[model samples]
Target chain A: VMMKLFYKPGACSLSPHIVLREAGLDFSIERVDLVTKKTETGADYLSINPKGQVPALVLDDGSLLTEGVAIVQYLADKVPDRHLIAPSGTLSRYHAIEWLNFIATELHKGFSPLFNPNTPDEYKTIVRERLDKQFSYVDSVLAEHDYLLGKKFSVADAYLFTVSRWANALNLQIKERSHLDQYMARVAERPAVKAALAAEDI
Target chain B: VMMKLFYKPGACSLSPHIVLREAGLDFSIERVDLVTKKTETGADYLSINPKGQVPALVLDDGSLLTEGVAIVQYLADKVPDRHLIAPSGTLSRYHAIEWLNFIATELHKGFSPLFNPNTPDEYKTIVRERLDKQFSYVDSVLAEHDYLLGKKFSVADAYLFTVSRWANALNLQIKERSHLDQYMARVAERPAVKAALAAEDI
Candidate 1:
């Protein structure tokens, strides 16, 4: 299936970008200015996604798919031979979904308030403490498993690495989370992930 | 397979509780006091779920599943004959996951700050305004579709209804979103949903 991703460099859209390349699928990408809601080619982004968000995938059928979690899941299922995700209907698959959901809520959106200038300094402090605790839990998980789902890296690892990469910028005590530190190192080594990094120039 | 849910009255755990009943699966519930990490019985809730969150489900094989999004998917799949969810591997199935993901990040956790007493008033105001916009978008969706997935109430509706119920309590300008109000009313009329409400004493 022909696919294209609308993305903003270093945004949560990076998760799906990494998954698209890692799955080894044929796809193209267009940059978007989220603030202006304009594409690289000067198309109105809102015309593509009414919500005017990045990481919207235009599929072969020309239908648009949004939400990083769903986009990655769709990509993973398209090529099960890659084992990009576990087989659906299995407990392992749901566990993979569980990890994705946690990363999205606890790690992805958790970083949101810190990025908003209008956010009160008092609230930012609270967010940092909360993220420290969240990352600490993730650190503990990586202590036993090489990847989120245990031995193998799945789409969850991609999403996790995409968002968790913010710790160093936010200075949220990643040094204390040696396991997570190493996990990020491991994900960054994958060529497909590197390709996404280079493409986004982020 | 035997199943039991660890829940708190009127918490997001209510989503899975409603799904369990709607799916027509045999299940039992145990209450947890999230603060003290104690169950209704004498066991430490942390021992059951180190995360110490409500909505953890214990399967017959003694494995525990946490996260409301994942738990509801597990339940809906178990009783797919009821069409509680779309079959896995379909575009519609991922769309269901998409809605659940959005609710988890935007609507569910969006309410977190408002509920936190320590949150600064300034941040609380920001949160309320953000929720107002998010629900307003949801209102547009409800204006078109009876349920999130259209025509039928899938697991997404259960999760959406679970968190959107907080709007009235928080006073998030909900009166302006008449469609959401009507959607909630329609969901509340379902016997399985009413049963969960009665059991939760909501």
Candidate 2:
């Protein structure tokens, strides 16, 4: 099967990109320039994804799958032996989804204000303060559990790592959270994550 | 099995509340005052859900599930006959999740600015403009399909309806979008949705 991932360097797409490598799937990557709405191959990206977002996966059958959480779950399910996630029909599976939703809404969307250069400094301060509170909660959780779900390297780790990277780039106080910092190092050492970072030149 | 849902009136929690009714499951609802961080029963809500967010579900075994998207999917999957969501591992299920993620991140979080009185008017304007563009895209899709996943009334419909309702509460221009307006009406007519709405006194 021919699978291709559309991504922008250092963006949320890195989550699915890490999952692809973790699943040991044979796939190609295409860098997208979101501002220009063009792909590396000169294709009109909007024709493929009207959302014009990165991390759009094109499956072997040429169907498009968007959304990082949805894409990583699809990849994990495809290679169940890897156990990247809990099996279906288990309470743990929904628990995993719960963590994913938390990351998507609280941590991921919490970064929105800091992204806009035009955002007022007052609002940016508010956004960062909210993000710090959420990160503190996450750090407390990581203090007890190695992964978001407990003892496995699941796709949620990929997502948390991708979004947390922005903290360093934006100079947020993530380093002060010792537990979260250790978890970040634990995730970064995975060979698959190393491979993904090397490939993206990040 | 026993189930309890903690929610605020007309908040995003309404999505899962609607699904619980849609799946014809027996459950109890408790209101939470997010401002006071108190549940109707006087238990500290944060002790039950550290996030202190509404739409927390406690299963019969006392296992907790937070996050509206995960809760709705869990409820729907529990009663496969209801078909509120596609079965796990199916292509349709991923698409269903894709829609859920879109609504959670884009539409739901987009309204966070309007809810904050401290947000600068200039920033709120930017937020509204961005949301208008996303709603326009949703309107385009609703024009083609009766539900987010097409003919079937799935969990995604419940989620979209819950979040889009904010457009009306915030005085956004959702009514001008004929397809979304029609879609909202279609979802509202469902007995389960009406029951949930009435239950919440919304």
Candidate 3:
């Protein structure tokens, strides 16, 4: 099956980039400029993804898939030997999905107010504090297990690593959490992750 | 397997509550009072779910599962004959998940600022305008399809129906979208959905 991934550098799209590499899948990437809503191929990205969001996937059948969590799961399931996600019908798979949802709602969306120029400073502080607390919880979880689901690398790690990078760019205080600090270093050392980072030029 | 779902009345948890009924699974429910952080069973809600969120499911094995999207998917997968979700490894399953993530991140999280008393009125306006645009897009989509995936009911519709209810509570302009209004009424007519709403006192 043919696949094309549309992404912007270092954005939330990085999660799927890492997963695509980890799954050992062959795919093409097109860079999107969010401001101009244009792709590197000069295509109107809005026509490709009406949401005008990055990290959309176009399948060989011409069906488009959006949402990083779903795209990563799809890629992971496509190659069962890779085990990028737990097999469906297992309780662990739902747990993996649970982590994905938590990351999407709590950590990913939690960073929204900070990104908005319209957000007041007072609200930004409140947002950061909530993120800090959530990061602390993640830190505690990481302390007991090497990954979000423990032992093996999964799509959840790719997603977490993607959003956590924003902590540094946004200058949040996540560095103080030792477990999260080590987890970041651990995930960074993966060859697939490194390759994805290089390809994205992040 | 035994299942106990912890939920706050009429919250997003209602989506999974509806799915649980749709699946016709025997499950127990416990109401959580978010204000007091207490469950109907008198358990400290935060201790059960560290996130202190509604819609936490406890399996017979005592493992806790959080996140409404994850919970509904789990419940649906448990009863494959019910077709609450598409079977795994199929393209439709990923598409279902794609809709789930979109609902969770865009439509669901987009309503957060409206719920927060601390959110600025000006920013609230920005949030409303954005949600209104999204609702219009959904209306357009519904004009063609009877449900989110078209023709058949799936877990995605349960989620979309739950979150869209907030539009009326907030008095957003979504009422002007006739297609969305009809879609909401259609979903509201389901026996399973009706039972769920009655149980949740919605």
Candidate 4:
């Protein structure tokens, strides 16, 4: 099956990019300029994804899947032997989802303010403070586990790494959270993770 | 088996509370004052949910599930016959998750700025406009389907309704989106929806 991933280097799309490699799926990647909503091939990205977001996966059948969480899950489930995510109907699976949502909300979307040039400097400070509190909580958890989900590298960790990179780019005191710093390094240490970075030239 | 849901009235927790009722499962609801991080019984909520968020579900054996997206999926899977979410391993299920994450990140968390007192009014306007754009996109979709998943009240609609309530509460021109206004009414007409609202006294 031909699965092509639309991505912008170093963005949240990087999450699915890593999952694709980790899942060891045969897929192609296309760069997207999110601001212009254009793909590398000069195709109208919005026509393919009205949502106008990266990490949009075009499946073999030409159906489109958007959203990083959804795309990674689809990829993980496709290659169940890899166990990129926990199997369904298990408590661990729900916990995997819990971690995913926490990253999406408190960590991923939480970075919104810092990225927006229009956001007031005062409000950005508020966002940073809130993000720091959440990152500290994540650090405390990482202190006990090698990965966000116990000792395994799952889609949740891919997601956390994708968004946490932005925290460092924005200089949000991430190094002070020693546990999270190590956690980031742990994810970066994965061969697939390195492959994804090279693929995106990040 | 006893299942209890800790919630703040009309918060995002309302999504899972409705799902529990929609799934025809017996569960108890407890109110949490998010600001105080206290439940109605005055037990320290923090001990239960270190994150201090609502919609924390305790399973019969006292296992905990936090995060509205995770909680709703757990509840929906508990009763597959209810079809609150599509069964796993199906493309529909991935689409369902796509909807859930969109609601969690875009619609749910988008309300954060308007609710925070410290957020600059200038920033709040930006938030409102961004939210307006998102709501309009939702309105466009609702115009085409009876529910978010099409022709059924899925967990996605419940989640959409839960957060859309905040739009009305914040007076964000929700009514001007006539299709969304009607979609909100459609979900509100469900017996489980009414039951959950009454249970929360909202």
TM-scores, one per candidate: 0.98, 0.98, 0.97, 0.97
Best by lDDT: 2
Per-residue alpha-carbon lDDT of model 2 for A92-199, expressed as tens digits? 999999999999999999999898888989889889989889888889889887987898889999999999898878889653489888899989999999999999
CA displacement after TM-score superposition, residue A185 of candidate 1 (Å)? 1.6
Off by over 4 Å in 4: A174-176, B174-176
The full ranking of all candidates by DockQ, starting with the best, is 4, 2, 3, 1
Give the whole-model CA lDDT for all candidates, comma-separated.
Answer: 0.89, 0.91, 0.90, 0.90
| Chain A alone, TM-score per model | 0.97, 0.97, 0.97, 0.96
**lDDT head-to-head 2 vs 3, winner:** 2
Residue by residue across B1-202, what tens digits does model 1's lDDT show? 6798999998999999999999888888999998999998979989889889988999878899998889999989988789988999999997898899999999998998888888888878878988888899889889997998899989999999989888877777753588999899999999999999898878
lDDT for each residue of candidate 3 in A20-133, tens digit (9 for 90 to 100): 899888888899999899999999999999999988998777789998988999899889998888999899999999999999998998898898898899988888988898
Model 4 agreement with the true structure over B1-202: per-residue lDDT tens digits: 6899999999999999989999998889899999988889999999999999988999987899999999999999999987888899999999999999999999899999898999888889889998898899888888887988788788888899999999998889643498998888878989999999998887
The residue pairs found clashing in candidate 2 are none
Candidate 3 residue-wise lDDT, B1-202, digit = tens: 6789998877899899899899998898999999899998898999999889988999888999999889989998989998889998999899889889989988899999899998889889888988888888888888898888878889999999999888888898763489889899999999999998889887
For candidate 3, give the lDDT of residue B4: 90
Pick by TM-score: 1 or 3, better one: 1
Q: What part of the reference interface contacts, as a 0 to 1 fraction, does candidate 3 reproduce?
A: 0.82
